[PDB]
Amino acid sequence: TLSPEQLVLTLLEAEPPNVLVSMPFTEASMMMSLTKLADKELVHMIGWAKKIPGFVELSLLDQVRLLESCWMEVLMVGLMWRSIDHPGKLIFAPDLVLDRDEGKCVEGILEIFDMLLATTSRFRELKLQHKEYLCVKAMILLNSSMYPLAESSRKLTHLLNAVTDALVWVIAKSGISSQQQSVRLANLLMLLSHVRHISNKGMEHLLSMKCKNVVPVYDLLLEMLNAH
């Protein structure tokens, strides 16, 4: 056991490096930029997970299944956080900032953009804090959603409980009423559940784009996509 403040500071220092992706958009080139970006981020995501304390003490199978299960949710919550103070824009990366209307370039993606933007808008209205963001991204990894994946399982429960306790502690510092602290926690958790659903949609869409030969999918992103 770390303190909740020690835990949150470990999550801060775990944060991955930022990545850059690098003609006007076609369906093809937009998906190329987005898939290129996702693949680079995935590399850093594994290193990030390894810095979440306890994560590397889990069985390797659990480590693998946790990342196969949550990687798209983690990409998406990162995106929402980068975008939180810019209504109508998705800040995918520096030099890849997309207006809502640019979803019209890719078949099916505008529905997903709007869901990502609406979720980002709820985080903005909630005034999601830096400390809360760190906790929720870690909770997503550690299977707050409880997707069905003894010692590794017991450890995992401990780790998720610790990050939940830290989020509760962060919320308590806000000084708002106990009733409002409970409602805030429920709202954040129901938002995580929504991100899971957007992730399922995203996965579907990417598998469709791959199938229709709209975009090639290589390497780590291919590996992670092959698991769904």
Partner: peptide
């Protein structure tokens, strides 16, 4: 080029 398990195991 580097896979999930290699990324998890190494460094």
């Amino acid at each position: 080029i580097q896979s999930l398990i290699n990324l998890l195991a190494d460094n």
